[PDB]
Every structure is written in structure tokens, then in C-alpha cells.
């Protein structure tokens, strides 16, 4: 018919789906260093996904690992282990003015 007509296909400019910082990585309850990056330094409270930036699957994995590690004797409950205070800050929250 006509060569210049549009053709049916999938979006070629579509950007790849964004991934959480833990996409494809194993979350173990023994890796207290990683788990400590998702709790409050002052209160030990687990950060919500709006702070951690994790997907639903990894927010659950981190949450379940923390609760397991805490009661099994690997991780403190009421504060972040001070050994891990100088690790990379991956959470979106600022407590100082």
C-alpha cells in the first residue's frame, strides 16, 4: 500500500525498569552490616520503604531478616550497632536540621 505509514511494534525508546539497590542480591540474617543500613541509628527502628527505597519484595526480605537476626543474637534491637555507623548512607532521611 504505502511505505510511510506507521508500523505496529513495541516502544523502542522504552527505558529499562528501575531496580532497587538490592535487586538480585541475597539478604541474609547473618549480614548484620547490610541490615543495619536500614534501621535508625538512634532508635533501631526499621525504616519504611519510602526511606529505604527498596521494592516490596526486598523491604519484606530486609524486615524479616532484621527480626530474625535480632532475636537470634546477631543484631541489636534498640540501636544501630555503632560499628556500622560509618557505612554508606543509602536511606533518604536527615535528622540534623
Amino acid at each position: 500500500s504505502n511505505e510511510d505509514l506507521p508500523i505496529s511494534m513495541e516502544n523502542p525508546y522504552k527505558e529499562p525498569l528501575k531496580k532497587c539497590i538490592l535487586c538480585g542480591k541475597h539478604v541474609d540474617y547473618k549480614n548484620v552490616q547490610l541490615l543495619s543500613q536500614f534501621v535508625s541509628p538512634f532508635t533501631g527502628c526499621i525504616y519504611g520503604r519510602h526511606i529505604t527505597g527498596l521494592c516490596g519484595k526486598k523491604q519484606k526480605e530486609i524486615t524479616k531478616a532484621i527480626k530474625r537476626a535480632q532475636i537470634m543474637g546477631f543484631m541489636p534491637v534498640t540501636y544501630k550497632d555503632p560499628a556500622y555507623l560509618k557505612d554508606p548512607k543509602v536511606c533518604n532521611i536527615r535528622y540534623r536540621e
Binding site: P41, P82, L85, R96
Partner: protein, 137 residues
């Protein structure tokens, strides 16, 4: 070095000192800020009592105890008895959200004590005892 709001961890080698004493050696001012009263006890790092003051021990009665000025007066009184025993720097541990939560700390400063840190130890049960039923007002 830049200032760290995180307290020095015991067992590590910090450079911070207060009158030649390490953070682990500074006495502790325990402030219990209740809804109807405020109690202040200063203790040594070894848990030796040094001074005690509350709004009730400062001559306030009933609802007057549950005021900021009542706690401020208790802080000054506890600071005075603690200063006589050699206390200058104190670590503040406050439990409770009463009206004398901050005022009790001011009185400690006006009494001649220097606060180097503030700690909240308000008890929060993680699931605990059932509190009393709500009030119909």
C-alpha cells in the same frame, strides 16, 4: 575534627575528655518527667547517688508540681547538692514526656552543671502491659 552527635563508644580510643574524665566516667542526671511531677537524681558513673530533687521535695503541691517552673526549681536544687560533691559535667537521661522534661534540664544548667549529652529513655513497650482505658471527657 568534625563534631559527632553520636556518643563515644566504650572500649574504643576516643580523644574527647571533660576535666580529664572519659565519657564513661561522667556522672548521670536521671530526670523522670511524669505528667504530674518531675524527679531528678544525679548519680556517679559507678551508680553512687549524689543528689536528689523533685517538684514535691521543693515545696510544690498537687497541680503545681506538674509545671515547667516546678521542674526548673527541682533542677537547681539537685544541681546545688551535686555541685557540692564535685559534679560539673553530667550526662542527662530523661524518661517521660511530662511538662518538666526540658525545664528540669534548664535548672541543672542554671545550677552550675554542664550538660554534655542528652539521652531519652522513655519506656516504649514493643507490644507489654495493657494501659488503662480511655477517659470520657
Amino acid at each position: 575534627t568534625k563534631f559527632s552527635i553520636y556518643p563515644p563508644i566504650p572500649g574504643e580510643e576516643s580523644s574527647l575528655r571533660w576535666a580529664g574524665k572519659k565519657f564513661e566516667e561522667i556522672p548521670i542526671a536521671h530526670i523522670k518527667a511524669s505528667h504530674n511531677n518531675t524527679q531528678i537524681q544525679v548519680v556517679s558513673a559507678s551508680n553512687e547517688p549524689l543528689a536528689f530533687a523533685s517538684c514535691g521535695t521543693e515545696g510544690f503541691r498537687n497541680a503545681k508540681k506538674g509545671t515547667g517552673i516546678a521542674a526548673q526549681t527541682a533542677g537547681i536544687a539537685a544541681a546545688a547538692r551535686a555541685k557540692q560533691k564535685g559534679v560539673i559535667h553530667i550526662r542527662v537521661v530523661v524518661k517521660g514526656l511530662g511538662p518538666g522534661r526540658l525545664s528540669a534540664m534548664h535548672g541543672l544548667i542554671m545550677g552550675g552543671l554542664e550538660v554534655i549529652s542528652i539521652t531519652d529513655n522513655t519506656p516504649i513497650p514493643h507490644x507489654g502491659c495493657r494501659p488503662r482505658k480511655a477517659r470520657k471527657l
